[PDB]
Design a binder for this molecule. Sequence first.
Ligand SMILES: [Cl-]
Ligand SMILES: [Cl-]
Ligand SMILES: [Cl-]
Ligand SMILES: [Cl-]
Ligand SMILES: [K+]
Ligand SMILES: [K+]
Ligand SMILES: [K+]
Ligand SMILES: [K+]
Ligand SMILES: [K+]
Ligand SMILES: [K+]
Lengths: 283, 283, 283, 283
Amino acid sequence: PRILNSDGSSNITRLGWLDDHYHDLLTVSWPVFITLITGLYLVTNALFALAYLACGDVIENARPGSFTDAFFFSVQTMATIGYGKLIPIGPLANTLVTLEALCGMLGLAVAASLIYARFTRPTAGVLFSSRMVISDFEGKPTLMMRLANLRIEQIIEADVHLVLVRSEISQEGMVFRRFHDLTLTRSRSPIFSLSWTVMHPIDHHSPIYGETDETLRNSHSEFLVLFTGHHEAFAQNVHARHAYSCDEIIWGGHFVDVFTTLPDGRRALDLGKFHEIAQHHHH
Amino acid sequence: PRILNSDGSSNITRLGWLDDHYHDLLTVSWPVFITLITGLYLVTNALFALAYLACGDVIENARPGSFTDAFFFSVQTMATIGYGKLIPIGPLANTLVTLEALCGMLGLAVAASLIYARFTRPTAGVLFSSRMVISDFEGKPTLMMRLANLRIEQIIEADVHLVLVRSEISQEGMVFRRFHDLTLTRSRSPIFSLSWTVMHPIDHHSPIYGETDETLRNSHSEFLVLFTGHHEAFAQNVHARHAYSCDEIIWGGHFVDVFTTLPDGRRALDLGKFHEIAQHHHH
Amino acid sequence: PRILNSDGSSNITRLGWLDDHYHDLLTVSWPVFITLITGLYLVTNALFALAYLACGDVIENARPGSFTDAFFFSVQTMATIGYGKLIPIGPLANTLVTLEALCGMLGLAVAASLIYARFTRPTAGVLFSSRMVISDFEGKPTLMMRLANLRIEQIIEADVHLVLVRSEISQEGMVFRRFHDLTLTRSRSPIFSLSWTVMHPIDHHSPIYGETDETLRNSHSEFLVLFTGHHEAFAQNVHARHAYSCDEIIWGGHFVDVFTTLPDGRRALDLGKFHEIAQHHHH
Amino acid sequence: PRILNSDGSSNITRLGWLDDHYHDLLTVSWPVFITLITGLYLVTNALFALAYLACGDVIENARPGSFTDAFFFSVQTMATIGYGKLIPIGPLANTLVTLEALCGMLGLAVAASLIYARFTRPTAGVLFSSRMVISDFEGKPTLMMRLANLRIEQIIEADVHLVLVRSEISQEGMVFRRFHDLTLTRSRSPIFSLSWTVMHPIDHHSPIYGETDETLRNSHSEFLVLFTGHHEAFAQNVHARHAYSCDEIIWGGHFVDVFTTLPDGRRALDLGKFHEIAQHHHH
Ligand SMILES: [Cl-]
Ligand SMILES: [Cl-]
Ligand SMILES: [Cl-]
Ligand SMILES: [Cl-]
Ligand SMILES: [K+]
Ligand SMILES: [K+]
Ligand SMILES: [K+]
Ligand SMILES: [K+]
Ligand SMILES: [K+]
Ligand SMILES: [K+]
């Protein structure tokens, strides 16, 4: 019954047409988006066609009062194919022409931006260790997890937040969900390129100080990770979030190592070991 | 007589043609913007038409020395419909043609950017509690208000500023308007997704320490909120501002709660309670 | 003989073809940029024309082996006007056609981006007080200057740096130019909308502590201001820089005030007073 | 056998089709990218051609059941040249027409964004001193290197990180690679315009305190520099990274100076001296 999902998205039921047009257009599925555009496209040409007929027989080589002919003329006109069978006749016909044109291009201009707006979304090639571990490092127990960059490109000024979320009681006795950002021994990495093992020493300042497993379940406490950085691949900012539950903390565990020396004598990164955590079993 | 409006825009009278072209183009209303473009469009084609006539009878199937014909030819040419009745004749005619073309496309290129520039403005789906409240939390009186995200998408590295604005006297006795940023118990939220109740503990460091209501009215003091964050919906930064007056502070009040358990046993968010503030009435 | 100009640009002589293509294209003057594009345009069509002739007489209604005809055909083809007199003949002709097309549009795609890239540059509507002043505020002498927003739109999370630049001697006796960022009583303004008077208290920590005018000239010291913020007008970041010389510091001066009450009883901002500094003359 | 290359890219062997489409399209070489586009272009027209034939003899002046004719018609249609020899016949023909059109433009819209996305990548005109030096400045030994801006345009809010990377042993005896950000006497430069000499004083807090050369080789320690700032040229953010090995530290060295006075009496910047480091040789 987790508040937060693994993908880091909160797991709550929300209780609440043309209002949010721009968001909606970027939020819709490509199929749908394309449909909408299409609809709009067809629609407007039909409207234009009517405008033509409305004048009456103003297009060369058009079957008299036939909408199809007018419609297809309108497309050839608005897409500026301008084949040349169907042609404007008289001032009214042409004005509508020079109006459509502009309309068509403006539409392109609007379509483009939408396309580009929806199209240009990078994704940090970042992978999160499936588990966290609590274990002694440099003489203090430390909570850690680790990120691996999945692409050859590097992430610049990358940095990460480790946030504990759990239920608390106020002195006034208000029982709420609170967020604690957890001090990391290293929160910035100006050049993230291969793997980064993030650590929160646990000492008298850690909100998880002197806490066992049972105490963690008890406050229904989870751990939220936000990673962000500027990706050289996209020359644009990227982010990635992940969440862990009390039970994905492997106490006493140690992340295995991912840095190897090849037979060749060349250093390497093995991402098979990435999710592997060493453990002592005491019968 | 408030200095700051609810929308957060300052409420002052300012005392001050082609100077600010780019701003103006992004600032104008869509109707107007479209008009301007249109004007420009029509205009330039007329100019081009004249260029054609100026050569004299250089277009196939054009009524001799008729501007309409030339004009419409110019559009068919510049929009590149190129129907094919009206056609260039001779070097002069065509050079103008190949010039227009380029002109037309450049215009498209310019129109597009404007369109996209004006079109691509997101808006944080963020809603501000209509009121603030001053009340004891964890043993210190605290000023608070709260934000609710209005969309399913999440806001990353969101953060908020609570700024007190009020009149002060210098030792030198200059009576000015000063801004005090108010320390919040939590000013960053790397993953804002549902509701956030922001708090400024009031203690010996709060510029509103040991201040009653009467003292607040007296310094004609308001409270300004700036929220900002990176919206996953738009993959782009968003912001939202709000302002409160001395009298929108509900002393002793407590925001009601918006987190519920459904019959289903599924957690939920009710935004009807969002503006509701509990209060003790003592006859 | 100032190191830094008023516009904030350093005032030094630098001592140092296709190398920096992208920068150069955004850096060139519009006239030039347009020329380049034009050149490129004409050029490529000529090349294409030759390709056509090279096949030999492959265009309907083209004077045999005439470059003009081929050239103009090439434009009508690459701009996709496609009038219809000149037409491809045979596989070779048309392949070149379908190649040009694509070429043309790609060019548009490239032109557009350049245009948009160069076109979309906002400018903070920000005006800098022509002078600084050193005067007592709240019981410490303070260096100040002030910014006024020149537009109705607001600047968000605006902030400013006041940097002293002057010559110094190391213990080792290296005589260099050093930069001192000067602590401001207020360095962030989350919502900058009208005027902001920036202040650097001078106390035992100010690098300009117990410094007279003569001492300032002596270190050939200037003051550099960088302002930056997110402009609502453009929904994009803006910046502005300014520089002051030792002699634009008006000692004992006080900026006059720009906030007024109208006859109407409505508050206002007068930017005529903006550059005016009060002063005591002692015969 | 360096972990980090001079260009700042880590020097490790990584061990790991349509999966990463967007990255891949921005990552591919221009030749390849253009090819892909071309392929896609040709391909789709062929598909469309088949659609036409499939209806059977629906294009004016087309050799019966000939794919070439159909293909070339399809291009003239999708690029909207619309010459006018080949023309649609009947509802089926034209519907396909009005479909292609839209398709073509959408493709343009998609191509454009890619182009612009890949095209609009600035590069900080920044040059890194080929060496570092350790030498006494203001009475403490200091590690330094220096950056020179290579262009007339200025970089705003520029800042730099000096990161030591070397092997360490935990109390628990885990022998890992750790990153130490090194405190710089000056880490921000709001207006970087000519040269900046960055310094890390070495004192009891420097992770390189009381370290000789032999000790540096021994921890196989390198130094990584990340520079970033907002480039006025591009009105966009830029970055640059560099790395140094233990042996590119010139102990006792002093960077020569690059600031000169011309015969004219005008100040100047000489970038020939930029890589030159003074040194005392003691036989
Ligand atoms: Cl076990
Ligand atoms: Cl009451
Ligand atoms: Cl005087
Ligand atoms: Cl030697
Ligand atoms: K066309
Ligand atoms: K077009
Ligand atoms: K056409
Ligand atoms: K035609
Ligand atoms: K664009
Ligand atoms: K952009």
